[PDB]
């Protein structure tokens, strides 16, 4: 299948550079536009710019708020495409997606990275702490996973195993630091009599941990 | 300077209704010589990736469900939902790319369904925090509409403010409902001084709080 994936996003200081990657593969790589576009944290989506394809000899062009600041470039040996941005400011803080453009027919994005966050800001990189959240029919359990800086983590239940109600509320940021929680409800049949374990990983720390949710 | 607007900014429909929604232009986006508007339409639904529902004004992505349609021409265009589902829950962005691409600012649109009640539960500092010198005390209002919710904690039977934080979660794209996180931390020297922990939840669906709460001492 087509595949997009972007990499490379993560903390850096304000002034500072970073550039990402998006490696492709499932299409010929050459025939395509690509273009990348980003989404700050609860906002709309922004295109950035775009490098076209073969035909069209690969120039690049940029959308004014970035034009000047921010270089696209491809290696088509190698189907992987980036974006090296500079002078980095708050405002840049966002998810960075590439996507599938032009082919000289059809005028469409028809496929997307699952996108790259990056985070622009002084405070340092901090590990989250993991706390078990432990009390009939339905029983709820959670992680609350506190202390932790820059986004994202993820939480998942029983390595991906439980994915039904699962909640994972949206961190919230407080003196530098966020916490968020996630709750699972499952039968009382099933637990404590088969385990529930909440896997989290912090991926700017390298941090990956299980906390088992033990009865009290 | 193609400027792109989108409205409404937001709306609310129950599941089996219409929504439209419109994409304003600044200027013209018909190619004259092609006969073709170079307007798209996405979808992003809560913790996904965009993904594209129609291009050229009124042409379908294979895969799409019918029930989408693209309309429209020259500066103005619509994205109707004929019947929305449950799972419709998402934020639409147009998007021209007659003059390189720009995307409008997005309609979010949200699913009504019935009232319903939120499941309370608490949970105690967990030993590891303790140990360690923190205490927080976690309540979860799980599966509820609407999304107007309001948390009082009671510590000894009192009523407490500072250090609650609360976090919503999108609308559910299975059954429409919301749920909220209500964490309140304490040292673990004020939180050793009392005995009663109460997480009161009071929603439109009752007069009565749902009240979930237990002892220190285990
Ligand atoms: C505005 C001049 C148009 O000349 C056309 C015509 O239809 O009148 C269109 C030309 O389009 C291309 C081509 O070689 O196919 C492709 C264009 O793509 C882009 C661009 O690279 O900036 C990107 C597309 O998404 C779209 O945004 C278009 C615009 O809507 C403008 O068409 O621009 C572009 O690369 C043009 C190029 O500027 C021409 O020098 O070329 C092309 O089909 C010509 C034809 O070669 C001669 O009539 O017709
Ligand atoms: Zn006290």
């Known amino acids: 299948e087509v595949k997009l994936v972007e990499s490379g996003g993560g903390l850096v200081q304000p002034g500072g550079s970073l550039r990402l990657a998006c490696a492709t593969s499932?299409?010929?790589?050459?025939?395509?536009?690509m273009s990348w576009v980003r989404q700050p944290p609860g906002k709309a989506l922004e295109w950035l710019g775009f490098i076209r394809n073969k035909a069209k000899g690969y120039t690049t062009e940029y959308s004014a708020s970035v034009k000047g600041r921010f270089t696209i470039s491809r290696d088509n040996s190698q189907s992987s495409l980036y974006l090296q941005m500079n002078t980095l400011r708050a405002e840049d803080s966002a998810t960075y997606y590439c996507?599938?453009?032009?082919?000289?027919?059809?005028?469409?994005?028809?496929?997307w990275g699952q996108g790259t966050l990056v985070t622009v800001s002084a405070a340092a990189t901090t590990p989250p702490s993991v706390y078990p959240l432990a009390p009939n029919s339905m029983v709820t359990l959670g992680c609350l996973v506190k202390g932790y800086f820059p986004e994202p983590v993820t939480v998942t239940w029983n390595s991906g195993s439980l994915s039904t109600g699962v909640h994972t509320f949206p961190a919230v940021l407080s003196s530098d630091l966020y916490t968020l929680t996630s709750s699972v409800t499952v039968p009382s049949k099933t637990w404590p009599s088969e385990t529930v374990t909440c896997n989290v990983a912090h991926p700017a720390s390298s941090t990956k941990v299980d906390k088992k949710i033990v009865p009290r | 300077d193609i400027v792109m607007t989108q409205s409404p900014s937001s709306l609310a429909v129950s599941a089996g209704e219409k929504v439209t929604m419109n994409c304003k232009s600044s200027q013209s986006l018909l190619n004259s010589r092609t006969r073709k508007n170079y307007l798209a339409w996405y979808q992003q639904k809560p913790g996904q990736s965009p993904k594209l529902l129609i291009y050229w004004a009124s042409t379908r992505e294979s895969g799409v469900p019918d029930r989408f349609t693209g309309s429209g021409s020259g500066t103005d265009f619509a994205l109707t939902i004929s019947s929305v589902q449950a799972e419709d829950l998402a934020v639409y962005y147009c998007?021209?790319?007659?003059?390189?691409?720009?995307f409008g600012g997005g309609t979010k649109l949200e699913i009504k369904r019935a009232d319903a009640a939120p499941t309370v539960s608490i949970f105690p500092p967990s030993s590891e925090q303790l140990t360690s010198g923190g205490a927080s005390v976690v309540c979860f209002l799980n599966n509820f509409y609407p999304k107007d919710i309001n948390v009082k904690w009671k510590i000894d039977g009192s009523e407490r403010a500072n250090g609650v934080l609360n976090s919503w979660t999108d609308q559910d794209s299975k059954d429409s409902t919301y749920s909220m996180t209500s964490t309140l931390t304490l040292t673990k020297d004020e939180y050793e001084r009392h005995n009663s922990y109460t997480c009161e939840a009071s929603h439109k669906t009752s007069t009565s709080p749902i009240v979930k709460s237990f002892n220190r001492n285990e």
């Open positions: 996507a599938r453009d032009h082919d000289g027919y059809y005028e469409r994005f028809a496929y």
């Open positions: 998007k021209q790319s007659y003059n390189l691409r720009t």
């Open positions: 499932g299409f010929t790589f050459t025939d395509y536009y």
